[model samples]
Target: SPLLEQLRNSSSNMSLKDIFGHSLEFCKDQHGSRFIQRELATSPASEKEVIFNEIRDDAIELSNDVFGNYVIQKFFEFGSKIQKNTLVDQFKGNMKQLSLQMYACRVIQKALEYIDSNQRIELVLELSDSVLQMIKDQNGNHVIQKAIETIPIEKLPFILSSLTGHIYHLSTHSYGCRVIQRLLEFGSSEDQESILNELKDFIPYLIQDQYGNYVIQYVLQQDQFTNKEMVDIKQEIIETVANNVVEYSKHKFASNVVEKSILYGSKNQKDLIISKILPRDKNHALNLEDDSPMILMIKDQFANYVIQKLVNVSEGEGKKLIVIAIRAYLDKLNKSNGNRHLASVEKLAALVE
Candidate 1:
């Protein structure tokens, strides 16, 4: 079969010398070389095969050079410049295919080496464009996934932000959300503020879609902000909702739903709410009081609700209402210190709205 034949003779079977030799041929070919050079310059597809073949041939050499960090760096620089051309754009899908094939050839070892060298950031950034393109072309996100695993903790925020932007622009919400969750999980306390700031704009967009709710829940759960910080974030979210609710009242405030549920629900209910809030089946309980921004937002929302309800009732009924509300709230708070209420509040809010 054609597939078997291609696989059999692929760069996997080629020697480092043979691979470099092929790259030299690519560099030297009059028509093919010019096409590649032009494509490199213009990002067109005319010479895409030439570049793809050249890169694939060199993958073995790149993979073998664990001690040759400079070689890998230079290779990326050269490859990125070449791949950025308009001429190369035409061959984008094909190049992605070639890159994936080359990646699969030695992904495990190369990824580990990159991690050891703390070069995961560079690798991730270098392949980001290609990863995004592949995602768009139905090329799979395995490359990005592999690259993310190698990312250092300190560099996670920037790397994740960049990846999120790329996937977001590509309209791959699920992929972008996954990257964001991983980023939050890996981020340090110092990185949290910057990371949240960078993601704020995208948050609204993500929240606007059902998928956005899932991402938001995942981010909140993964970051596990301090109780204080969670409270602060909850305040911020409540304020945001207050500002927008009157204008977009019918949009379904997912954050509100999530917050209320996480704050007041039981362990099983909290688990259920997280499952419902996140797009995927998240196994862990979403403990809102853990001090994440999302949890803080929920806390504030709960506080706000209590205050609003108290303020609205007639003075004669106020004490009765407060007592009843406090008992109900305490019941939830006792279950998980305000995590159990996340779902119930959401359901109640839906009905009231």
Candidate 2:
């Protein structure tokens, strides 16, 4: 408090001697590292190396230091190749700890980004045993993302091969789910099929699970997914969510899954969702009667998005029903969520009119 308070009270400009004289001390402290960041960001080559040599022995220390990690990356950006080699050597046997810690893992990611050759490959190799667990971890996933982006495409199979059996579990985890999507994008078609086969049976439950639904929706749209897979995945989406459109549409999270099913749902599947969503009332036009439960959906934040999507895609009687329901309930729509419901109703009015 006092140190920052003093800096706040101090003048806008600070000198180089003052900057680097306390370089090692300030770089190790979070508040002080900010000063080092400024120096690295603006200072000349000579002064940068001065700060580098000042903290030379502390290279690995700075890399591992949460506050000083910025300075370590600064070394990679401004320091010489010899300096980079020396800096990376410090991480030799300690790669496991660096991969596991939150901020330290970032330093590991930076290493992958700056070093393009096999030196970084050795680092990926270092990811050998512990890499699988890290795929599911919050912080470690970034390291894996950087690794995937930076690691050679030929070497990727090693990382992905290990992930094969865990597709169902990974699809359910937020971070692992992202890694799975990347694998499908970058891996071979064979790789795509391997991941999908493991995930196929779980599609129904995946759409119902909050996070897993996103993985299913994302991958289903990928080119790696064939006509057959699309047909099957679409059917699963319909069977699970569309079969109970009103109930799932009313859910907090499952509603999103229902909306996706409606948006890109196939010929038979789309009709199935529309049918369940707009159940029959022979006396009313387009079966969207005045007392319909779809009216309540106009006021819900999440469900309204799905309704808007459905309104956009449907044609003939299907489109007219949504338009009429929205027109009949414009005033009753939720106005608290940025008045978004009324805005959608106005937008829908423009389209259908």
Candidate 3:
């Protein structure tokens, strides 16, 4: 408490030397750790060296400490050349252990950003042995993302190889999905194609998966923007959704895939999606009495949201056809007290009018 009080009280004018022997202790205490971080930022090299010396032996342990991780990160940001290299040297053989540590992983990411290229290469080599395992870990996944983003593609062939046969599994994984997106965003055409090759066969399943949907959305977003080859990829992804619009739209997680399809899908792509939900003939109105795709969607808990998105994005003839169907259902939809159906339909009616 006294340590916290000393760090908390500004009037004490506590200097770094005052907390010398208690440096590691201060680094582990919430308030005290912040003080050490502040001093590390503004203190002279000699003063920082003294503090670093006190905690150097415990640097690895502290890197994963709840409060002390910040202390380790500050050293990476402000530690002298020798000090930074020394901290990384301590981390040489423990990359996977530290990277998988919930708190220590943050320090690994920081080290990647600040350490020299040679040191970075050496540090990340240890992570290669378990790249897939790390990608699936909640904490380790982030380290993989950082490595993908920081380390050069040439140096990271092992990662691509590790993920060679596991792209679909990873994309659907809770933590691995994030790492997959990073790979798509940063990997070269060859690397991107490798991941996409695996994902191509599983688009429908991915769109409905709780975590896989995110990876699907990321690919949809990349359709017009980044990858030169994603145009055809997007076409296939949209057509995949269009083929199963009704079932996917009614799904809890897949409903998001429906909304994103409308949000990002091209005119032909959105038209394909809209066509599946609308009646076959433009002259014939959607029948609300039966469980037609249109009626099922407007009545569905999740699909109602998708219908709302459809209303906002549809245009011209597609807009005309969708509006008429909603109008036919509006009175019936209003009779319901549930906002999930009634409110969404009312909002749709108001927007069209």
TM-score of each: 0.37, 0.79, 0.90
Please give the distance, in angstroms, between residue 314's alpha carbon in candidate 2 and its true position after superposition: 2.9
lDDT of 1 by residue, 51-158 (tens): 455565454443333322222332333444443232223323443343455333243323433333434454444454455453433224555554555666665344
When sorted by TM-score, best at the front, the candidate numbers are 3, 2, 1
Q: Lowest summed lDDT over 10 consecutive residues: which window, candidate 2?
A: 332-341
How well does candidate 2 match the true structure in TM-score terms?
0.79
Better of 2 and 3 by TM-score: 3
Off by over 4 Å in 1: 1-140, 153-172, 189-191, 201-205, 222-231, 238-353
Give the local distance difference test score of model 1.
0.41
Q: What is the C-alpha RMSD of each candidate to the true structure, in Å?
A: 16.7, 5.0, 2.7
Give residue 312's error in model 1 in angstroms.
25
Better of 1 and 2 by lDDT: 2
Candidate 3, pairs of clashing residues: none
lDDT of 3 by residue, 85-172 (tens): 8998899889989988989999999989998988888888898789888887888888888888888888888998987888888888
Q: What does the lDDT read for residue 100 in candidate 2?
A: 79
